[PDB]
Symmetry: C2
Protein backbone atom coordinates (compact mmCIF):
# COMPACT_ATOMS: atom_id res chain seq x y z
CA UNK A 1 0.00 0.00 0.00
CA UNK A 2 1.39 3.39 -1.03
CA UNK A 3 1.76 5.74 1.95
CA UNK A 4 3.04 9.32 2.08
CA UNK A 5 3.33 10.87 5.56
CA UNK A 6 4.35 14.49 6.15
CA UNK A 7 6.11 15.92 9.19
CA UNK A 8 7.78 19.08 10.43
CA UNK A 9 4.99 21.64 10.02
CA UNK A 10 4.02 24.14 12.68
CA UNK A 11 4.16 27.80 13.64
CA UNK A 12 7.05 29.99 12.50
CA UNK A 13 7.67 33.72 12.37
CA UNK A 14 8.03 35.74 9.15
CA UNK A 15 11.56 35.39 7.83
CA UNK A 16 11.99 32.14 9.76
CA UNK A 17 12.92 28.65 8.60
CA UNK A 18 11.18 25.28 8.56
CA UNK A 19 12.09 21.89 7.07
CA UNK A 20 9.33 19.50 6.03
CA UNK A 21 9.79 15.75 5.60
CA UNK A 22 7.77 13.07 3.82
CA UNK A 23 8.20 9.35 4.48
CA UNK A 24 7.33 7.21 1.47
CA UNK A 25 6.58 3.49 1.52
CA UNK A 26 4.79 0.85 -0.52
CA UNK A 27 6.57 1.54 -3.82
CA UNK A 28 10.05 1.77 -5.32
CA UNK A 29 10.77 5.32 -4.16
CA UNK A 30 13.70 5.92 -6.55
CA UNK A 31 11.58 5.25 -9.67
CA UNK A 32 9.26 8.23 -9.10
CA UNK A 33 9.53 11.98 -9.14
CA UNK A 34 8.30 13.36 -5.81
CA UNK A 35 6.50 16.64 -5.27
CA UNK A 36 5.24 19.23 -2.81
CA UNK A 37 1.87 20.91 -3.37
CA UNK A 38 0.33 23.45 -0.99
CA UNK A 39 -3.14 24.82 -0.26
CA UNK A 40 -3.45 28.17 1.50
CA UNK A 41 -6.37 28.28 3.97
CA UNK A 42 -9.59 28.76 2.03
CA UNK A 43 -7.75 28.79 -1.31
CA UNK A 44 -6.87 26.45 -4.16
CA UNK A 45 -3.91 24.27 -5.04
CA UNK A 46 -0.40 25.42 -5.96
CA UNK A 47 2.43 23.10 -6.97
CA UNK A 48 5.57 24.05 -5.03
CA UNK A 49 8.54 21.90 -6.04
CA UNK A 50 9.46 18.54 -7.56
CA UNK A 51 12.57 16.36 -7.83
CA UNK A 52 13.30 13.51 -10.23
CA UNK A 53 13.88 9.97 -8.98
CA UNK A 54 17.67 10.34 -8.99
CA UNK A 55 17.76 14.04 -7.97
CA UNK A 56 19.18 14.83 -11.42
CA UNK A 57 16.55 17.56 -11.88
CA UNK A 58 14.69 19.87 -9.51
CA UNK A 59 11.76 22.16 -10.31
CA UNK A 60 10.42 25.11 -8.34
CA UNK A 61 7.53 27.52 -8.61
CA UNK A 62 8.66 31.10 -9.22
CA UNK A 63 7.18 32.29 -5.91
CA UNK A 64 9.47 30.00 -3.84
CA UNK A 65 12.64 30.01 -5.97
CA UNK A 66 15.76 30.98 -4.06
CA UNK A 67 14.00 30.35 -0.73
CA UNK A 68 12.96 26.67 -0.87
CA UNK A 69 15.22 23.70 -1.58
CA UNK A 70 13.85 20.25 -2.38
CA UNK A 71 15.89 17.11 -1.74
CA UNK A 72 15.45 13.38 -1.22
CA UNK A 73 17.26 10.52 0.53
CA UNK A 74 16.68 7.42 -1.59
CA UNK A 75 18.37 5.18 0.99
CA UNK A 76 15.69 6.17 3.54
CA UNK A 77 12.78 6.77 1.10
CA UNK A 78 12.31 10.30 2.41
CA UNK A 79 11.52 13.59 0.65
CA UNK A 80 12.54 16.94 2.15
CA UNK A 81 11.67 20.60 1.61
CA UNK A 82 13.86 23.21 3.30
CA UNK A 83 11.89 26.47 3.61
CA UNK A 84 13.82 29.67 4.34
CA UNK A 85 12.77 33.34 4.37
CA UNK A 86 9.22 32.30 5.15
CA UNK A 87 6.50 34.81 4.29
CA UNK A 88 2.89 34.99 5.44
CA UNK A 89 2.02 34.08 1.84
CA UNK A 90 3.62 30.68 2.42
CA UNK A 91 1.00 29.79 5.04
CA UNK A 92 -0.68 26.63 3.77
CA UNK A 93 -1.23 22.95 4.27
CA UNK A 94 1.74 21.33 2.54
CA UNK A 95 1.05 18.01 0.82
CA UNK A 96 3.61 15.42 -0.21
CA UNK A 97 2.62 13.98 -3.56
CA UNK A 98 3.61 11.68 -6.40
CA UNK A 99 4.71 12.04 -9.18
CA UNK A 100 4.96 15.10 -11.52
CA UNK A 101 3.39 17.13 -13.14
CA UNK A 102 0.16 15.33 -12.27
CA UNK A 103 -0.34 13.89 -8.78
CA UNK A 104 -1.50 10.24 -8.45
CA UNK A 105 -0.95 9.97 -4.69
CA UNK A 106 -1.31 12.54 -1.91
CA UNK A 107 -0.37 12.55 1.74
CA UNK A 108 -2.68 14.02 4.35
CA UNK A 109 -0.60 17.21 4.55
CA UNK A 110 1.04 19.20 7.32
CA UNK A 111 0.10 22.76 8.29
CA UNK A 112 2.67 25.56 8.03
CA UNK A 113 1.60 28.85 9.66
CA UNK A 114 3.80 31.93 9.14
CA UNK A 115 2.48 34.33 11.77
CA UNK A 116 3.86 37.30 13.68
CA UNK A 117 2.63 36.15 17.09
CA UNK A 118 -11.58 43.11 0.88
CA UNK A 119 -9.69 43.17 -2.44
CA UNK A 120 -10.91 43.78 -6.01
CA UNK A 121 -13.51 41.55 -7.66
CA UNK A 122 -12.14 39.27 -10.39
CA UNK A 123 -14.57 38.27 -13.14
CA UNK A 124 -13.85 35.13 -15.18
CA UNK A 125 -15.94 34.03 -18.16
CA UNK A 126 -16.65 30.63 -19.71
CA UNK A 127 -16.23 29.20 -22.17
CA UNK A 128 -13.38 30.93 -23.97
CA UNK A 129 -15.00 30.15 -27.33
CA UNK A 130 -18.57 29.12 -28.13
CA UNK A 131 -18.79 27.45 -31.55
CA UNK A 132 -22.43 27.45 -32.65
CA UNK A 133 -24.59 27.70 -35.77
CA UNK A 134 -27.05 30.52 -36.53
CA UNK A 135 -30.40 29.98 -34.87
CA UNK A 136 -28.86 28.01 -32.02
CA UNK A 137 -29.06 28.95 -28.35
CA UNK A 138 -25.94 30.50 -26.80
CA UNK A 139 -25.35 30.31 -23.04
CA UNK A 140 -22.45 32.41 -21.73
CA UNK A 141 -21.21 32.29 -18.13
CA UNK A 142 -19.60 34.88 -15.85
CA UNK A 143 -18.16 34.20 -12.39
CA UNK A 144 -17.42 36.78 -9.68
CA UNK A 145 -14.74 36.14 -7.07
CA UNK A 146 -16.95 37.88 -4.48
CA UNK A 147 -20.70 38.27 -4.08
CA UNK A 148 -22.42 40.72 -6.45
CA UNK A 149 -26.13 41.42 -6.72
CA UNK A 150 -27.77 41.07 -10.12
CA UNK A 151 -28.34 44.85 -9.84
CA UNK A 152 -24.60 45.36 -10.44
CA UNK A 153 -23.66 42.90 -13.20
CA UNK A 154 -23.65 44.27 -16.76
CA UNK A 155 -23.03 42.68 -20.15
CA UNK A 156 -21.29 44.15 -23.20
CA UNK A 157 -20.77 43.13 -26.81
CA UNK A 158 -17.86 43.92 -29.13
CA UNK A 159 -18.20 43.10 -32.81
CA UNK A 160 -14.91 42.66 -34.72
CA UNK A 161 -13.37 45.98 -35.70
CA UNK A 162 -15.91 47.94 -33.64
CA UNK A 163 -16.01 49.48 -30.18
CA UNK A 164 -17.69 47.75 -27.23
CA UNK A 165 -21.37 48.47 -26.72
CA UNK A 166 -23.55 47.91 -23.68
CA UNK A 167 -26.09 45.09 -23.89
CA UNK A 168 -27.51 44.92 -20.35
CA UNK A 169 -27.16 47.44 -17.51
CA UNK A 170 -28.06 44.90 -14.80
CA UNK A 171 -30.30 41.86 -14.37
CA UNK A 172 -31.96 41.56 -17.78
CA UNK A 173 -32.54 45.30 -18.35
CA UNK A 174 -31.37 45.96 -21.90
CA UNK A 175 -29.94 49.12 -23.42
CA UNK A 176 -31.72 50.90 -26.26
CA UNK A 177 -31.71 49.01 -29.56
CA UNK A 178 -30.68 45.67 -28.02
CA UNK A 179 -33.22 42.98 -28.99
CA UNK A 180 -34.92 40.74 -26.46
CA UNK A 181 -33.10 37.57 -27.56
CA UNK A 182 -30.39 38.71 -25.11
CA UNK A 183 -31.32 38.04 -21.50
CA UNK A 184 -29.26 38.11 -18.32
CA UNK A 185 -29.72 35.96 -15.24
CA UNK A 186 -27.99 35.03 -12.00
CA UNK A 187 -27.14 36.83 -8.78
CA UNK A 188 -24.32 36.34 -6.31
CA UNK A 189 -21.31 34.63 -7.89
CA UNK A 190 -22.55 32.97 -11.12
CA UNK A 191 -24.25 34.80 -13.98
CA UNK A 192 -25.54 33.89 -17.43
CA UNK A 193 -26.01 35.77 -20.69
CA UNK A 194 -28.44 33.84 -22.89
CA UNK A 195 -28.78 34.53 -26.61
CA UNK A 196 -31.89 32.50 -27.35
CA UNK A 197 -31.36 32.26 -31.13
CA UNK A 198 -28.11 33.41 -32.72
CA UNK A 199 -28.25 35.86 -35.61
CA UNK A 200 -25.29 36.46 -37.95
CA UNK A 201 -24.47 39.75 -36.20
CA UNK A 202 -24.40 38.00 -32.79
CA UNK A 203 -21.09 36.28 -33.60
CA UNK A 204 -18.83 38.51 -31.53
CA UNK A 205 -16.97 38.81 -28.23
CA UNK A 206 -18.99 39.35 -25.04
CA UNK A 207 -17.78 40.82 -21.74
CA UNK A 208 -19.40 40.87 -18.32
CA UNK A 209 -18.72 43.70 -15.88
CA UNK A 210 -19.45 44.23 -12.20
CA UNK A 211 -20.47 47.79 -11.29
CA UNK A 212 -20.83 47.46 -7.52
CA UNK A 213 -17.41 48.73 -6.46
CA UNK A 214 -14.46 50.68 -7.83
CA UNK A 215 -12.71 49.53 -9.96
CA UNK A 216 -15.63 48.22 -12.03
CA UNK A 217 -13.88 45.15 -13.42
CA UNK A 218 -14.58 43.23 -16.63
CA UNK A 219 -14.35 39.53 -17.30
CA UNK A 220 -11.81 38.33 -19.81
CA UNK A 221 -14.37 37.80 -22.58
CA UNK A 222 -16.15 35.01 -24.43
CA UNK A 223 -15.93 34.72 -28.21
CA UNK A 224 -19.04 33.34 -29.93
CA UNK A 225 -17.85 32.12 -33.31
CA UNK A 226 -19.61 30.38 -36.17
CA UNK A 227 -19.28 26.60 -36.46
CA UNK B 1 -27.62 62.36 -31.28
CA UNK B 2 -25.01 61.55 -28.64
CA UNK B 3 -21.47 61.73 -30.02
CA UNK B 4 -18.13 61.13 -28.29
CA UNK B 5 -15.01 61.79 -30.39
CA UNK B 6 -11.48 61.10 -29.14
CA UNK B 7 -8.29 62.87 -30.17
CA UNK B 8 -4.63 63.15 -29.26
CA UNK B 9 -3.49 59.54 -29.52
CA UNK B 10 -0.34 58.44 -31.29
CA UNK B 11 3.18 57.15 -30.77
CA UNK B 12 5.15 58.10 -27.67
CA UNK B 13 8.30 56.80 -26.00
CA UNK B 14 8.39 55.08 -22.60
CA UNK B 15 8.37 57.69 -19.86
CA UNK B 16 6.81 60.21 -22.26
CA UNK B 17 3.62 62.23 -22.01
CA UNK B 18 0.38 62.40 -23.98
CA UNK B 19 -2.92 64.24 -23.46
CA UNK B 20 -6.13 62.77 -24.83
CA UNK B 21 -9.29 64.77 -25.50
CA UNK B 22 -12.93 63.80 -26.01
CA UNK B 23 -15.52 66.13 -27.55
CA UNK B 24 -19.04 65.43 -26.31
CA UNK B 25 -22.25 66.59 -27.97
CA UNK B 26 -25.93 65.70 -28.13
CA UNK B 27 -26.58 65.74 -24.38
CA UNK B 28 -26.24 67.98 -21.33
CA UNK B 29 -22.55 67.27 -20.71
CA UNK B 30 -22.51 68.60 -17.12
CA UNK B 31 -25.21 66.15 -15.95
CA UNK B 32 -23.10 63.03 -16.61
CA UNK B 33 -19.99 61.46 -15.19
CA UNK B 34 -17.48 60.92 -18.01
CA UNK B 35 -15.00 58.07 -18.27
CA UNK B 36 -11.96 56.63 -20.01
CA UNK B 37 -11.77 52.90 -20.74
CA UNK B 38 -8.88 51.23 -22.57
CA UNK B 39 -8.31 47.99 -24.48
CA UNK B 40 -4.75 46.73 -24.92
CA UNK B 41 -4.17 45.12 -28.34
CA UNK B 42 -5.62 41.62 -28.29
CA UNK B 43 -6.82 42.00 -24.69
CA UNK B 44 -9.96 42.88 -22.76
CA UNK B 45 -11.40 46.04 -21.26
CA UNK B 46 -10.00 48.06 -18.35
CA UNK B 47 -11.67 51.13 -16.88
CA UNK B 48 -9.07 53.89 -16.49
CA UNK B 49 -10.56 57.00 -14.87
CA UNK B 50 -13.84 58.84 -14.31
CA UNK B 51 -14.93 62.32 -13.23
CA UNK B 52 -18.30 63.47 -11.90
CA UNK B 53 -20.40 66.02 -13.76
CA UNK B 54 -19.09 68.94 -11.69
CA UNK B 55 -15.52 67.60 -11.23
CA UNK B 56 -16.27 67.25 -7.51
CA UNK B 57 -14.98 63.66 -7.58
CA UNK B 58 -12.36 61.83 -9.65
CA UNK B 59 -11.68 58.09 -9.76
CA UNK B 60 -8.61 56.26 -11.03
CA UNK B 61 -7.54 52.67 -11.50
CA UNK B 62 -4.64 51.70 -9.25
CA UNK B 63 -2.36 51.03 -12.24
CA UNK B 64 -2.56 54.66 -13.47
CA UNK B 65 -2.81 56.54 -10.15
CA UNK B 66 -0.21 59.27 -9.75
CA UNK B 67 0.51 59.23 -13.50
CA UNK B 68 -2.84 60.07 -15.14
CA UNK B 69 -5.03 63.09 -14.40
CA UNK B 70 -8.63 63.33 -15.61
CA UNK B 71 -10.33 66.69 -16.11
CA UNK B 72 -13.22 68.27 -17.98
CA UNK B 73 -14.18 71.67 -19.39
CA UNK B 74 -17.95 71.96 -19.03
CA UNK B 75 -18.02 75.25 -20.95
CA UNK B 76 -16.61 73.44 -24.01
CA UNK B 77 -18.14 69.97 -23.38
CA UNK B 78 -14.71 68.35 -23.49
CA UNK B 79 -13.13 65.58 -21.41
CA UNK B 80 -9.36 65.32 -20.96
CA UNK B 81 -6.88 62.70 -19.76
CA UNK B 82 -3.29 63.82 -19.12
CA UNK B 83 -1.00 60.77 -19.30
CA UNK B 84 2.51 61.08 -17.83
CA UNK B 85 5.24 58.50 -17.18
CA UNK B 86 3.85 56.35 -19.96
CA UNK B 87 4.75 52.65 -19.84
CA UNK B 88 4.52 50.00 -22.54
CA UNK B 89 1.70 48.52 -20.43
CA UNK B 90 -0.35 51.64 -21.20
CA UNK B 91 -0.43 50.78 -24.91
CA UNK B 92 -4.11 50.48 -25.81
CA UNK B 93 -7.01 51.93 -27.71
CA UNK B 94 -8.43 54.55 -25.34
CA UNK B 95 -12.21 54.99 -25.44
CA UNK B 96 -14.17 57.96 -24.16
CA UNK B 97 -17.33 56.72 -22.49
CA UNK B 98 -20.40 57.68 -20.50
CA UNK B 99 -21.24 57.48 -17.61
CA UNK B 100 -19.87 55.47 -14.62
CA UNK B 101 -19.45 52.70 -13.47
CA UNK B 102 -21.33 51.19 -16.41
CA UNK B 103 -20.86 52.62 -19.91
CA UNK B 104 -23.98 53.50 -21.97
CA UNK B 105 -22.13 55.32 -24.75
CA UNK B 106 -18.70 54.74 -26.29
CA UNK B 107 -16.57 56.70 -28.70
CA UNK B 108 -14.65 54.99 -31.47
CA UNK B 109 -11.39 55.24 -29.50
CA UNK B 110 -7.91 56.57 -30.20
CA UNK B 111 -4.75 54.44 -30.27
CA UNK B 112 -1.91 55.13 -27.83
CA UNK B 113 1.32 53.24 -28.58
CA UNK B 114 4.15 53.41 -26.02
CA UNK B 115 7.12 52.07 -27.99
CA UNK B 116 10.89 52.43 -27.81
CA UNK B 117 11.37 53.10 -31.53
CA UNK B 118 4.99 32.83 -23.65
CA UNK B 119 3.84 33.25 -20.03
CA UNK B 120 2.19 30.79 -17.63
CA UNK B 121 -1.17 29.17 -18.39
CA UNK B 122 -4.07 30.46 -16.27
CA UNK B 123 -6.94 28.04 -15.66
CA UNK B 124 -10.35 29.43 -14.72
CA UNK B 125 -13.34 27.26 -13.79
CA UNK B 126 -17.09 27.77 -14.06
CA UNK B 127 -19.41 27.98 -12.36
CA UNK B 128 -18.17 28.89 -8.90
CA UNK B 129 -20.95 26.83 -7.33
CA UNK B 130 -23.15 24.13 -8.86
CA UNK B 131 -26.32 23.61 -6.82
CA UNK B 132 -27.84 20.27 -7.81
CA UNK B 133 -29.82 17.35 -6.36
CA UNK B 134 -28.55 13.76 -6.08
CA UNK B 135 -29.03 11.83 -9.29
CA UNK B 136 -28.77 14.96 -11.42
CA UNK B 137 -26.18 15.57 -14.11
CA UNK B 138 -23.30 17.90 -13.23
CA UNK B 139 -21.36 19.71 -15.97
CA UNK B 140 -18.21 21.52 -14.83
CA UNK B 141 -16.14 23.79 -17.10
CA UNK B 142 -12.43 24.64 -17.22
CA UNK B 143 -10.83 27.27 -19.45
CA UNK B 144 -7.14 27.56 -20.36
CA UNK B 145 -5.61 30.92 -21.27
CA UNK B 146 -3.45 29.14 -23.88
CA UNK B 147 -3.92 26.03 -25.98
CA UNK B 148 -3.59 22.68 -24.18
CA UNK B 149 -4.14 19.23 -25.64
CA UNK B 150 -6.59 16.93 -23.89
CA UNK B 151 -3.52 14.77 -23.16
CA UNK B 152 -2.41 17.39 -20.60
CA UNK B 153 -5.59 18.41 -18.75
CA UNK B 154 -6.29 16.59 -15.46
CA UNK B 155 -9.17 16.73 -12.98
CA UNK B 156 -9.06 16.44 -9.19
CA UNK B 157 -11.61 16.16 -6.40
CA UNK B 158 -11.38 17.40 -2.81
CA UNK B 159 -14.02 16.29 -0.34
CA UNK B 160 -14.49 18.55 2.71
CA UNK B 161 -11.87 17.92 5.38
CA UNK B 162 -9.88 15.60 3.09
CA UNK B 163 -6.88 15.93 0.81
CA UNK B 164 -7.23 16.36 -2.96
CA UNK B 165 -7.35 13.18 -5.01
CA UNK B 166 -6.84 12.66 -8.72
CA UNK B 167 -9.92 11.85 -10.79
CA UNK B 168 -8.62 11.95 -14.38
CA UNK B 169 -5.01 11.98 -15.62
CA UNK B 170 -5.94 13.34 -19.07
CA UNK B 171 -8.79 13.08 -21.56
CA UNK B 172 -11.23 10.74 -19.81
CA UNK B 173 -8.62 8.32 -18.42
CA UNK B 174 -9.59 7.78 -14.78
CA UNK B 175 -7.40 6.96 -11.81
CA UNK B 176 -7.88 3.72 -9.87
CA UNK B 177 -11.10 3.53 -7.88
CA UNK B 178 -12.77 6.46 -9.67
CA UNK B 179 -16.15 5.33 -11.10
CA UNK B 180 -17.13 5.84 -14.71
CA UNK B 181 -19.79 8.46 -13.96
CA UNK B 182 -16.90 10.95 -14.13
CA UNK B 183 -15.84 11.70 -17.69
CA UNK B 184 -13.61 14.40 -19.14
CA UNK B 185 -13.91 16.06 -22.53
CA UNK B 186 -12.55 18.98 -24.52
CA UNK B 187 -9.21 19.89 -26.04
CA UNK B 188 -7.60 23.25 -26.71
CA UNK B 189 -9.01 25.99 -24.49
CA UNK B 190 -12.34 24.69 -23.11
CA UNK B 191 -12.77 21.49 -21.11
CA UNK B 192 -15.62 19.72 -19.34
CA UNK B 193 -15.88 17.38 -16.37
CA UNK B 194 -19.22 15.58 -16.51
CA UNK B 195 -20.65 13.74 -13.50
CA UNK B 196 -23.52 11.91 -15.19
CA UNK B 197 -25.50 11.20 -11.99
CA UNK B 198 -24.52 12.79 -8.69
CA UNK B 199 -24.03 10.56 -5.66
CA UNK B 200 -23.96 11.93 -2.09
CA UNK B 201 -20.16 11.63 -1.97
CA UNK B 202 -19.82 13.64 -5.21
CA UNK B 203 -20.77 16.88 -3.45
CA UNK B 204 -17.28 18.36 -3.19
CA UNK B 205 -14.86 20.83 -4.76
CA UNK B 206 -13.32 19.98 -8.15
CA UNK B 207 -10.11 21.36 -9.65
CA UNK B 208 -8.74 21.15 -13.17
CA UNK B 209 -5.01 21.18 -13.83
CA UNK B 210 -2.88 21.55 -16.94
CA UNK B 211 0.23 19.34 -17.01
CA UNK B 212 1.79 20.44 -20.30
CA UNK B 213 4.28 22.99 -18.96
CA UNK B 214 5.95 24.03 -15.71
CA UNK B 215 4.38 25.30 -13.51
CA UNK B 216 1.48 22.84 -13.80
CA UNK B 217 -1.27 25.26 -12.82
CA UNK B 218 -4.67 24.54 -11.26
CA UNK B 219 -7.98 26.24 -11.85
CA UNK B 220 -9.58 28.06 -8.95
CA UNK B 221 -12.10 25.30 -8.24
CA UNK B 222 -15.80 24.56 -8.61
CA UNK B 223 -17.91 23.62 -5.59
CA UNK B 224 -20.74 21.16 -6.28
CA UNK B 225 -23.16 21.59 -3.39
CA UNK B 226 -26.51 20.03 -2.61
CA UNK B 227 -29.66 21.98 -3.45
Amino acid sequence: EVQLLESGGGLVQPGGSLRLSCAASGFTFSSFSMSWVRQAPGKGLEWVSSISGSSGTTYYADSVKGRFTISRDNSKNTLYLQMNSLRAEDTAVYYCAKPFPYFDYWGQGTLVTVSSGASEIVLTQSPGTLSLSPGERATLSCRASQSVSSSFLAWYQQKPGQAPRLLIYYASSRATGIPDRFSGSGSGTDFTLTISRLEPEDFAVYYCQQTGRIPPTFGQGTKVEIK
